Amino acid sequence: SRMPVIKPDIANWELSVKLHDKVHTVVASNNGSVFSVEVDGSKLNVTSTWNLASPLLSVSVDGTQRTVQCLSREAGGNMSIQFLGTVYKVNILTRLAAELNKFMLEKVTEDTSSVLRSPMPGVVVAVSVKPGDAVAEGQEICVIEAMKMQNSMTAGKTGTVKSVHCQAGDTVGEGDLLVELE
Amino acid sequence: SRMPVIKPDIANWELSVKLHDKVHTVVASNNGSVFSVEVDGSKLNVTSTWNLASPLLSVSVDGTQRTVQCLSREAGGNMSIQFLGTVYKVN
Amino acid sequence: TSVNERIENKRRTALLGGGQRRIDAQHKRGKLTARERISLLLDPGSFVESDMFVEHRCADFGMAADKNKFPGDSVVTGRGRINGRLVYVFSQDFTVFGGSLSGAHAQKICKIMDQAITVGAPVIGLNDSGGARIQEGVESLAGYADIFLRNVTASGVIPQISLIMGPCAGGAVYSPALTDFTFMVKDTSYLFITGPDVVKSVTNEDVTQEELGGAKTHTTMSGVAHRAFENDVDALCNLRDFFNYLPLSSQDPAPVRECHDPSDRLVPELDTIVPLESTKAYNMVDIIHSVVDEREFFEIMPNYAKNIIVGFARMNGRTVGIVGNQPKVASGCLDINSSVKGARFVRFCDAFNIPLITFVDVPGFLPGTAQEYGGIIRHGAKLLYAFAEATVPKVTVITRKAYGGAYDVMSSKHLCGDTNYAWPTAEIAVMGAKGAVEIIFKGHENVEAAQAEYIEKFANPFPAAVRGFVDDIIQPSSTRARICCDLDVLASKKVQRPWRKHANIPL
Amino acid sequence: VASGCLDINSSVKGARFVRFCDAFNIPLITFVDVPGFLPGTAQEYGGIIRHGAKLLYAFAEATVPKVTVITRKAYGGAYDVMSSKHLCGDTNYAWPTAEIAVMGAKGAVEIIFKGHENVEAAQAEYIEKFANPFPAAVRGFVDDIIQPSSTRARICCDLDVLASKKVQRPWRKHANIPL
Amino acid sequence: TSVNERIENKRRTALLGGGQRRIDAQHKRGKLTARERISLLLDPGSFVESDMFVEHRCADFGMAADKNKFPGDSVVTGRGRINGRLVYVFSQDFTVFGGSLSGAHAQKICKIMDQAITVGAPVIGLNDSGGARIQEGVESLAGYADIF
Numbered sequence A: 001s002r003m004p005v006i007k008p009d010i011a012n013w014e015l016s017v018k019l020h021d022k023v024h025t026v027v028a029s030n031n032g033s034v035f036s037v038e039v040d041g042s043k044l045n046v047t048s049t050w051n052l053a054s055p056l057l058s059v060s061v062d063g064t065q066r067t068v069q070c071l072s073r074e075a076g077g078n079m080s081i082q083f084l085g086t087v088y089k090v091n092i093l094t095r096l097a098a099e100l101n102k103f104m105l106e107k108v109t110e111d112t113s114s115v116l117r118s119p120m121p122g123v124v125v126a127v128s129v130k131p132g133d134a135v136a137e138g139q140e141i142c143v144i145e146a147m148k149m150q151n152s153m154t155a156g157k158t159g160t161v162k163s164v165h166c167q168a169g170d171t172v173g174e175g176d177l178l179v180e181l182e
Numbered sequence B: 001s002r003m004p005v006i007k008p009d010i011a012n013w014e015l016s017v018k019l020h021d022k023v024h025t026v027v028a029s030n031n032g033s034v035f036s037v038e039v040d041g042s043k044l045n046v047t048s049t050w051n052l053a054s055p056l057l058s059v060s061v062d063g064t065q066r067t068v069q070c071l072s073r074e075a076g077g078n079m080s081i082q083f084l085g086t087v088y089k090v091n
Numbered sequence C: 001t002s003v004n005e006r007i008e009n010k011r012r013t014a015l016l017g018g019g020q021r022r023i024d025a026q027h028k029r030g031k032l033t034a035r036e037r038i039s040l041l042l043d044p045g046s047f048v049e050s051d052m053f054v055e056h057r058c059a060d061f062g063m064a065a066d067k068n069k070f071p072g073d074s075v076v077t078g079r080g081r082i083n084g085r086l087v088y089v090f091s092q093d094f095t096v097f098g099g100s101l102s103g104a105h106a107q108k109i110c111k112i113m114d115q116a117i118t119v120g121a122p123v124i125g126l127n128d129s130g131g132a133r134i135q136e137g138v139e140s141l142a143g144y145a146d147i148f149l150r151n152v153t154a155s156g157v158i159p160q161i162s163l164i165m166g167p168c169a170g171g172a173v174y175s176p177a178l179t180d181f182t183f184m185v186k187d188t189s190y191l192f193i194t195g196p197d198v199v200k201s202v203t204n205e206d207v208t209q210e211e212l213g214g215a216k217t218h219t220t221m222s223g224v225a226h227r228a229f230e231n232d233v234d235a236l237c238n239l240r241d242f243f244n245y246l247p248l249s250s251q252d253p254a255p256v257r258e259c260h261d262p263s264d265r266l267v268p269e270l271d272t273i274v275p276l277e278s279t280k281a282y283n284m285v286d287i288i289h290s291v292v293d294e295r296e297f298f299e300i301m302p303n304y305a306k307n308i309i310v311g312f313a314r315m316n317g318r319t320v321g322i323v324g325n326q327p328k329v330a331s332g333c334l335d336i337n338s339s340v341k342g343a344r345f346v347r348f349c350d351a352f353n354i355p356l357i358t359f360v361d362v363p364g365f366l367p368g369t370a371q372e373y374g375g376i377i378r379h380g381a382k383l384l385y386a387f388a389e390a391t392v393p394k395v396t397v398i399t400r401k402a403y404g405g406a407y408d409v410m411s412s413k414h415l416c417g418d419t420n421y422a423w424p425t426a427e428i429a430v431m432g433a434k435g436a437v438e439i440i441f442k443g444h445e446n447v448e449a450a451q452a453e454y455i456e457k458f459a460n461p462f463p464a465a466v467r468g469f470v471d472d473i474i475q476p477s478s479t480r481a482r483i484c485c486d487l488d489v490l491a492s493k494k495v496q497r498p499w500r501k502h503a504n505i506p507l
Numbered sequence D: 001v002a003s004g005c006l007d008i009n010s011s012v013k014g015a016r017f018v019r020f021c022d023a024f025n026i027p028l029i030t031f032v033d034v035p036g037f038l039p040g041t042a043q044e045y046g047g048i049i050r051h052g053a054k055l056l057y058a059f060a061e062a063t064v065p066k067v068t069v070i071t072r073k074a075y076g077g078a079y080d081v082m083s084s085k086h087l088c089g090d091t092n093y094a095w096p097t098a099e100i101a102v103m104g105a106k107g108a109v110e111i112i113f114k115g116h117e118n119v120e121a122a123q124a125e126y127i128e129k130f131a132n133p134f135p136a137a138v139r140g141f142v143d144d145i146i147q148p149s150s151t152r153a154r155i156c157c158d159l160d161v162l163a164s165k166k167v168q169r170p171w172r173k174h175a176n177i178p179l
Numbered sequence E: 001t002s003v004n005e006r007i008e009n010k011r012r013t014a015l016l017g018g019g020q021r022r023i024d025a026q027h028k029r030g031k032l033t034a035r036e037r038i039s040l041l042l043d044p045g046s047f048v049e050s051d052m053f054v055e056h057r058c059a060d061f062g063m064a065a066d067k068n069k070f071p072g073d074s075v076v077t078g079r080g081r082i083n084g085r086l087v088y089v090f091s092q093d094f095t096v097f098g099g100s101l102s103g104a105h106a107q108k109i110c111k112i113m114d115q116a117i118t119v120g121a122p123v124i125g126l127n128d129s130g131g132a133r134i135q136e137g138v139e140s141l142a143g144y145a146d147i148f
C-alpha cells in the first residue's frame, strides 16, 4: 500500500542467445501462456503452464510436445537445459546488454585443477591413491585430520596420479601440494 | 530546570545620572540591603527594604531617614521621584 | 545562438561526460561509462535524471576556464525502477577529472540521498573515482562529510548498496564501508586509503594495486567486500537479482513474490545427509539448497570465513535470511571472522524485518593464542548480541552437536527464539561426552561403566527435549514444511523492549 | 605515539567509548591532531576501512553535545572522522597552529602544479595561503580561532549552553554499524 | 608575517567592519554600529561571537579583489545573555557593502538560527541592510529563502 508497483510495460524482448559459439537474434513476445518467438526470422509458438519450480516442464512448440528440464540458471545469463536427453549450455542476454558486452575484456581464466593441495593444517590419516592410479572426479585422494573431524580431500577431475607428494602420518600445512593429476 | 539561569556577576554599576541639565558620575555597589554610592567623589550609604511595589519607600541615607515616592519610571532611564515633597525628573 | 540551442549543446556535452577520447580510454580498460551502467541497471525507459547542468564552482588554479567546466561534473544521479520498484541511483563518472569528488558532486549525491530518505526508497551507488578534487581543497572534504552523515542517518532506514567498479582511494572508501552491502568487480576495482607508492615510501613494502586493494583481497582476506563479479555486465545483472530480495524501507515487511514451489514439499534426501560418526563432515549448503524455494540461494561472502554460511533465500515466496554452521570447514567451529560475518548479516536482517533461519552444528570456538590475542571474546559476543537483539521471527534447526556457549550463541531458545527444532542426530551438551565423564567421574576406577551410562543418557537430544529447550524432534524430510508453517504463524510477531537511544554492542 | 595516526585498534577503542558516552547522555570533548591513517598492508588486510568507519559512524550518530578543538594538523578523511562540524557537531574551535587541509602541502603542490617548472614560487604561495586555519575559518568550518589559554573557559561556557540540546532523527529499529 | 600576526590583523579588521570612515558616516546619521548595538543589548561580558572570519566567496565583477574581502561580511552573529537568560542575536552591518545580503551573510544567520532551535532559545535580529547583493545574483536569493 505504501508504494504501489509500476509494471514495466514491455511488448517485445530482444535477446542475443549464444548456443554453440553462435549468436542468434531472438524477438520474444507473450500473450497469456503463449509465447511468440522469432528466431533468425523463423516464427514459433510455445505454450505451457510455465511452472518454474517443477523439475520437469512440458511445453508445446507449434503443436509438437516437448519435455525439458532446467538444470541451472544464473543472473548473468547462463542456462543449462536438458532437451531431447542432452544438456545444452546457452547464454541469454538482452540486446543492449549484448552490445555493451563487446567492451568487456576476455579474462585469463587459467586455473589448473590438476594439482591437489591441503586446505587446512592437519595430519594425513591415509592416502587412497598411488602414482599411475585412476581417479574419478569427486573421488577421495587423501584424508586429513584436524580437531578430530577426518577432513576428506577429493580429486578435482577424472585422471591419473602423476605424483603423490604426501604420506600417511605427515603433518601437512595449508597450501601444501598433496597430489598431482594429469 | 530545562535552562538554569546564570546570574550576571556585577560588582560595581557605573551610571551617568542627569538631574537638572547636569550629568553626575555615580558608582553604586550593594551588599544585602545596603547600597554604597559614590557620587562625584562623595560616599553615601542607603538602607531600606527595597519594596518596589509600595507607593511609599522609606530609606536611610547615612542614618538620615527619608520617605520617597517613585511616581514613574521607563526602560529608557527616565524616573520621577518625589523627594522632600518635590517631584524631580532624573535620567 | 539562442537559449534553446545552447540547451541542446549542454545536453549533448553532458551526455558525453569527459569526451569521446576519454570514453574510448575507459572502454579499452574493459569498463563501461556511468550512463551505460545506469542503462544496464535500471528498467528500460525508467531512468529520470536530476541535475544534468550542475557544474563545479571552483575558481582556483585556472579551474574557472571554460575547458574545465563540465555539465554534470563527474557524477550522474537520478531515480529509476528495478522490476517495477522505485530506487535512487548515483554513478561516478571517471572521465571527468578522474571522477574526483568536488562540491557539486557531493551536492548531487546528497540531494538524491535526501530524496530517497524522504520517500523511503533504497539507494545504489556505483563508485569509480580517484578521490578528492585537490583543487577544491577543504571544500571536497566537507562534501565527503556531508555524504558520511547522511549514510549514518540512513542506516537502518533504507537499504544502501555500493558497487565498486573502478579505482577508489582515500576518504572516498569510507562511504561504501558505511553502507549495508559492498560488491566489487574483479580486476578493475580496488579499495585502499593509501596507495602503493606511499606504502613503499613509509613501510618499505612492495605491493601492486591489485594486491593492496583488489577485489580478491577484500573478498577473501579483509572481509570488507561481500561479493566479487567478473564484469560490469555480470555485476549489474547480479545486482538487479540481489535488489529483488530487499524491502524498500524499514517501514515495509519482507517482500513476498509469486511462488511455485509447494510449501509442503518433502525433502527425503535429508534423512541420511548427516553421518552417524561425529568425525565425518557434510556440506550444510546442500541442506540449505534442499530446504529453500527452487534451490535458489544468494550467498554473502562465499569465499571469506567459510566455516559459517550466510545468505538470502525465499520460503513460500517470502524473503528469508539463512545462517548456518559449515562442518566442512574447520569442523564448523566459530572464530573471529565468522563471528563478525554472521553478526553483521543478522543485524541487517533484523533491521529490515527479514525472518532468520539458522542451522546449528557447532562443537565450539576455535582455540589457540591467535584467537585469544585477536579478541575472540568480543567478536563472539558480537554474534551472540546480534541474535539476542533480533526481534524478527527466528527459526532454529539443530542437525548435530551443539556444545557449550556456542549452543547459546547460535540463536538458542533462551535468546527469546521462536521455534527450535532438533534432528535425531542432535546433541545438546555442555561439552564432549569423554571430557564430561573425565571431569565428573575422575577419581573413580570403574570409568567404563559410568561412561557408557553417561553416553546412553546424555549423548542425544533427550536432555534438551525433556526440558523444553527444543520444541520438538522432527524427521529431517519434513524440515521445509515445518519451517514454512512457522513462518506463516510468526509473520505478525511483535515484541516490547525498554526504551533507549541505542544499545552498546561490543566492537 | 605513531604521530597520532589512526588505525584499527585505536579506531575501535575510540568508537566504543564514544558510543557509550552518547548512550548515557555524557557530553564529548575532542582534541584533534591527526595526519591521517596508518599505512601498510597489515592495516589493509586487517580491514582498516570498516574499523575506521566504526569511529566515523560513532561520531556521526552521537546526539549528545560535542565540542571539538583542533590543536594542529587535520588532514584528509581523518579530519572528517574526528567529529568534524559536518557530522552535526556543535562547536568547533581551532588553535593558531591548526591546519585543515586535504593533505600535506608538499603533496598538494606536487599534484596540482606538476608539469610546471616554477615549482618553488607556486609552492611558497600555496603554503602562505593554505598551510593555516584560514581556509576552514573563512568557510565557517570552525566557529572561531581561539587563544589556547582560554580553551577551558570557552568549553565550560559551551557545555552550559548545550545542556538542553535535543535533535530529531528518522525512526528505525536500530542502525547497522560496520562490524 | 607569522600566522598569529595575520590572526590579529584579521581580528582588528573585523572589529572595524567597513572601516573607520564608514563608521563615522554611520554615526553622523545618528545610528550605532552593529557591534555597539550588540554591546548595548546584551549583558556585559556575555557576548560570544561566531564566524568572525567568514568571508564572501563571490568571484564576479571584481568581487575577488582583496579590497572587496571583509572578515565577517556585513553581519555579526552570536549568543549572549539578557538578565541571565540565554539568547541568540544577529546584527546587520551597514558599513560593509551597505549591509547587502550575500551567501555568507545568510549562512551565518542560518547557523545561529539552527543553534537556537537546537537548544531552544529566542532569536533577536537587528536589521539594517540595503537588500540583496546584486553581484552574487541568484545566490543572494537562495540565502533569503534559507532564512525564510
Ligand SMILES: O=CCCCC[C@@H]1SC[C@@H]2NC(=O)N[C@@H]21
Pocket (backbone or CB within 6 Å): A147, A148, C331, C333, C363, C364, C365, C366, C367
Ligand atoms: O586434539 C583434540 C582434542 C581437543 C579438541 C577440542 C575441539 S577443537 C574445536 C572445538 N573447540 C573447543 O574448544 N574444543 C573442540
Ligand SMILES: O=CCCCC[C@@H]1SC[C@@H]2NC(=O)N[C@@H]21
Pocket (backbone or CB within 6 Å): C194, C198, C201, C202, D003, D005, D035, D036, D037, D038, D039
Ligand atoms: O616517508 C614519508 C613519506 C610518507 C609519509 C606519509 C604519512 S604516514 C602517516 C600519515 N598517513 C598517511 O596516509 N600519510 C601520512
